[PDB]
Every structure is written in structure tokens, then in C-alpha cells.
Amino acid sequence: CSSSNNDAAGNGAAQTFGGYSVADLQQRYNTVYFGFDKYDITGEYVQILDAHAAYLNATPAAKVLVEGNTDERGTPEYNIALGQRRADAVKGYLAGKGVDAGKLGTVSYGEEKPAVLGHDEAAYSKNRRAVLAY
Amino acid sequence: AXKXX
């Protein structure tokens, strides 16, 4: 049916890519949470992939920069690798949706610059994340 | 050993 909700009767043109607007996709929903040496995304964070994809495709010169950062435990080479690959997962995702590789970007600062100090499921879980950076 | 953890 579509057009079930009305803002002010003006029109539906309102900025809403896959559910959210740029100002939200860039500051609210753009971070994914991974697990211990996990190389898979979760349905809970999938929505972003489809939303960012709609916005990314809508803009020809729009390129997404996936930032990966897992637990410091180990070494940049071990992390960066594990992450860069996970990053390859999301990068290839948008790629399968029709998004050009030239607009895709991946990186990882594993042990380089840790986020949550400490080494416990709490701090560690908070560290296992790849933040969609534009 | 792996990635430790």
C-alpha cells in the first residue's frame, strides 16, 4: 500500500532512505557489533547495510568508509587481518547491491588505537565493532 | 594458538 503514514500532508518526498534519514544514518545507526574472532554480521545490524546502501547508491560520488576495530588482544597483523576481512564482508555486501567498489572503503586499527580500555567481555564486546564511516 | 581472547 505504502504512504500509510502522513507527516503534515505535504508529501512523502521527505528524506527517508530505507527507513532513516542521512542525519540519522550518519550519527545514529552506522555501527555493527561483532564477537570473539567472529566473521559474520547480525540481522540486528543488517538494516543499516540496506539503508546505507540505498543512500550510497542514490549518490554517484558517495563512498562509504567501513572502519573496523576489534579487541586489542593479539597484534595489528592478526587483528587488522581478521577485521579487514570482516570489512570485506560488508564492503562486498553493498557491492552485491550494485554499489561500485570505488565508492567502498575498508580499514582496521585493531591494536593500533583501542577503544574500550580493559580485557573483559564488557570492554571487549564494546570493542568488537566496525563503525560505518562516511 | 589463534587470536587468543
Side-chain angles (χ1 to χ4, degrees):
Chain A
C1 217
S2 83
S3 83
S4 218
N5 342 99
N6 196 237
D7 320 278
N11 221 277
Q15 301 294 137
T16 51
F17 288 98
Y20 323 118
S21 333
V22 189
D24 228 72
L25 301 152
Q26 284 248 53
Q27 309 180 41
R28 244 257 217 283
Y29 311 109
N30 56 107
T31 302
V32 190
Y33 273 65
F34 290 81
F36 171 22
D37 218 77
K38 242 61 157 262
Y39 194 146
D40 51 89
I41 308 142
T42 77
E44 218 133 271
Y45 290 102
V46 168
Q47 38 82 10
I48 333 184
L49 269 45
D50 66 49
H52 277 314
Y55 156 80
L56 201 86
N57 187 302
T59 24
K63 61 209 283 60
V64 77
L65 206 187
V66 214
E67 275 193 282
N69 298 302
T70 63
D71 67 330
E72 57 76 58
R73 236 297 169 165
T75 25
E77 270 271 313
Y78 197 122
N79 315 113
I80 222 127
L82 241 287
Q84 205 255 26
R85 307 154 111 202
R86 308 145 129 225
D88 245 304
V90 187
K91 92 81 107 83
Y93 191 116
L94 306 170
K97 302 179 103 269
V99 187
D100 210 85
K103 279 135 66 51
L104 290 144
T106 69
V107 266
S108 145
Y109 306 103
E111 290 227 18
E112 184 101 278
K113 318 267 205 315
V116 200
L117 252 58
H119 46 99
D120 321 83
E121 186 51 20
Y124 261 15
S125 286
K126 285 182 266 158
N127 258 350
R128 283 128 40 182
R129 85 206 158 160
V131 195
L132 270 268
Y134 272 114
Chain B
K3 194 220 93 65

